[PDB]
Design a protein around this ligand. Structure first.
Ligand SMILES: C[As](C)(=O)[O-]
Ligand SMILES: C[As](C)(=O)[O-]
Ligand SMILES: [Mg+2]
Ligand SMILES: [Zn+2]
Ligand SMILES: [Zn+2]
Ligand SMILES: [Zn+2]
Ligand SMILES: [Zn+2]
Lengths: 347, 351
């Protein structure tokens, strides 16, 4: 396939004899198969083969677009690698595995192939975009359900369980990540995963969730308030809303991820809340919840049509609470498109 | 010097005996096991001969400081972390540490040599304390409740994924953080797929249905598999079922200290092979369970680990007939002084 072809081209330019792909999302991206257990793709100058343990063979044989080989013990796999001098690998390959490759496969050199994997996955195909949009649609439904479920006295975890159930009933494999239902002081926390805390009147409630649908992810955050907001809560909400909207409106091909982050960050900084916006503006979304590019002050990746990223500025104040508004957006030919469509002005 | 816990000291012992200058622990389950902290972002424990420190990003400091039993240090940029590592000659690392990170350590921390510390981590985690066993047993209680709920929910017409959604909700409402792994509800031809995660397929009468699920509860895992038939089973379904049941029961009864994992795997495998279904029992008999659903030891033909009191493993033989159906019966068990204890207690003879 075209993906294997691009890897072979990269191998030729970088004097790599063979490439090993082992990370789940990359194995699926290339072969179309997703063995839960350990699956490995070996790409040579003229072939691509997926190796899987026997228990995953039947599933892999019916889902893979490249030849499949099964093995009983890892020794058979290494035997298939003996002879390779320079091996291209993912930066995620674990130490234990690399040491086994040196000892049992006699690999002489390792080179990172992350660049070619990134260059491919960072631009979504029309088909991938449609799956991501469906995942976002499911996430939108989950956020609305969360709002309905929220009431004084209910545990954050109960709301989370209820909406995760709804997402799965809508076709999701599972949540894209641990659901965040953070109320009151918890809304100002770094990663407020739903807890046993009970929601209280006057609480700001951050709802950050996503659905994993047919291998692709979605990501959305909306913040609401139980009852009426006080002056401070309303103020930080208005600023985050302004920053989020301006950043989304500014997203387009040609500008750097850093430039985009600066748009939202400068708005928040000018209002005097710069020290309370403690994370990046966003991240890419695809086969993984967090992927390329990183939308921050440290990544100047030039945006291009086909990229899918989140725009999620926020302001977090100890005890008082926090506000975050996040959308998963698609970079189009001339601008952007919000894939998550839930109303943002909720406070 | 620091007053360090016994887990840290066991690592220090290993360090001295293996000429290692310092040890870096970065995998979540290990960081929790050693410090009690659960940094969602990147937490790193650095152990030296006289100190143990947990380094975490700013967005993790406050919580880590509250849950960690060892001194916590925060950093704004990784360069700050690598600076702390400067001077280390031989660094002990986990077999899970990624290539990219190791290359960074080589250049920014100028680490000269790396050595595996997997053996000491394994030696500690492979034997569960009475405290850990109680947590795992409760997770198994939650898993048992989920399996019983699944059986009651499974009927002709039901979508596999919907059954999964219902029992995963039940587990959470019963205290579980979340499922230990993607719930498997494999019906009909799908029961022939060992890892047939619940799908959009609708269950039909006469279907063999494999239910494999588990709960992550207070950091520990549970794992259970029961197979049922919707309606009356035919003779061929009953045949493979009786064989798997016989093999599973015999293996559980044979589990005791002194036997190797390979010898235990052979008990179940030889039974299934004698019936001529050896080619269809395409996976190991089991795996250890603890902070991770899959851990030491591997109960297979390729593991010589001698079982000891305190080990927690699964016993899950199965037979899978391609495109037709399959059967798997799995229990999480505890190795006792001279036998075993079934932590998962749901009835096994369900057809
Ligand atoms: C909490 As998130 C998946 O938006 O980084
Ligand atoms: C599907 As399992 C966690 O029993 O290997
Ligand atoms: Mg200190
Ligand atoms: Zn999010
Ligand atoms: Zn996000
Ligand atoms: Zn299982
Ligand atoms: Zn298992």
């Amino acid at each position: 396939n075209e993906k294997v072809k691009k890897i072979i081209e990269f191998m030729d330019k970088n004097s790599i004899d063979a490439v090993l792909i082992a990370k789940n999302p990359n194995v699926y991206y290339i072969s179309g198969a997703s063995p839960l257990a350990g699956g490995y793709i070996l790409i040579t100058g003229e072939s691509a083969t997926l190796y899987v343990p026997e228990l995953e063979y039947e599933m892999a044989k019916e889902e893979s677009n490249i030849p499949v080989e099964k093995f009983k013990k890892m020794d058979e796999f290494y035997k298939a690698l003996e002879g390779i001098k320079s091996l291209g690998i993912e930066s995620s390959l674990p130490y234990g595995f690399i040491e086994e490759l040196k000892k049992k496969a006699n690999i002489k050199e390792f080179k990172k192939v992350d660049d070619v994997i990134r260059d491919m996955r960072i631009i979504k195909s029309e088909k991938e975009i449609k799956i991501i949009e469906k995942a976002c649609e499911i996430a939108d439904k989950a956020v609305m359900a969360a709002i309905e479920e929220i009431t004084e006295g209910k545990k954050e975890r109960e709301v989370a369980a209820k909406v995760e159930y709804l997402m799965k009933m809508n076709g999701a494999e599972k949540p894209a990540f641990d659901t965040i239902i953070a109320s009151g002081y918890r809304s100002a926390l770094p990663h407020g995963v739903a807890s046993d805390k009970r929601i209280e009147r006057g609480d700001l409630v951050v709802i950050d969730l996503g659905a994993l649908y047919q291998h692709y992810n979605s990501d959305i955050t909306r913040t609401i308030v139980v009852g009426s907001p006080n002056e401070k809560q309303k103020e930080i909400y208005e600023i985050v809303l302004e920053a989020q909207k301006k950043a989304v409106e500014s997203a387009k091909p040609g500008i750097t991820a850093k430039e985009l982050d600066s748009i939202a960050r400068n708005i928040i900084a000018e209002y005097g809340y710069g020290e309370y916006f403690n994370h990046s503006l966003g991240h890419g979304v695809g086969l993984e919840v967090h992927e390329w590019p990183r939308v921050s002050q440290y990544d100047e990746t030039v945006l291009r049509e086909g990229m899918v990223i989140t725009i999620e500025p926020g302001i977090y104040i100890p005890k008082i609470g926090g506000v975050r508004i996040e959308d998963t957006i698609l970079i189009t030919k001339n601008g952007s498109k919000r894939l998550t469509k839930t109303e943002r002005e909720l406070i």
